[PDB]
Design a protein around this ligand. Structure first.
Ligand SMILES: [Mg+2]
Ligand SMILES: [Mg+2]
Length: 123
């Protein structure tokens, strides 16, 4: 279960990576921006799950998701968006783009653990 976690917040990347570790998901690659994330996916198509935010310079998460879904290798990759964009217009936009599970920031570490366990369980 190779995961890629994309967020331009260093503290958020830490929280997510620690939470995944608590759930037994130890094989985690990070990215700060969409460009870097895409490069990593394109070069490591064995990646199993994409976790991404929305707002960030160097390609945002909506465009990253669109790009992922248009690639023949990633038609079925699970995509979790974790974002402060809590409005339903934005949720709808992201789901149309190919996001499968939407988690809205902010959260305590315990809440994130509960919400990720809902989608990924433990490993
Ligand atoms: Mg962001
Ligand atoms: Mg936050």
């Amino acid at each position: 279960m190779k995961l890629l976690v994309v967020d331009d917040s260093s503290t958020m990347r830490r929280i997510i990576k620690n939470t995944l570790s608590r759930l037994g998901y130890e094989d985690v690659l990070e990215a700060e921006h969409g460009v870097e994330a895409w490069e990593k996916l394109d070069a490591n198509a064995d990646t199993k799950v994409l976790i991404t935010d929305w707002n960030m310079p160097e390609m945002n998460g909506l465009d990253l998701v669109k790009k992922v879904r248009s690639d023949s290798r990633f038609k079925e990759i699970p995509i979790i968006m974790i974002t402060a964009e809590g409005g339903k217009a934005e949720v709808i936009t992201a789901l149309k783009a190919g996001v499968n599970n939407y988690i809205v920031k902010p959260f305590t570490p315990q809440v994130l653990k509960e919400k990720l366990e809902v989608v990924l369980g433990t490993n």
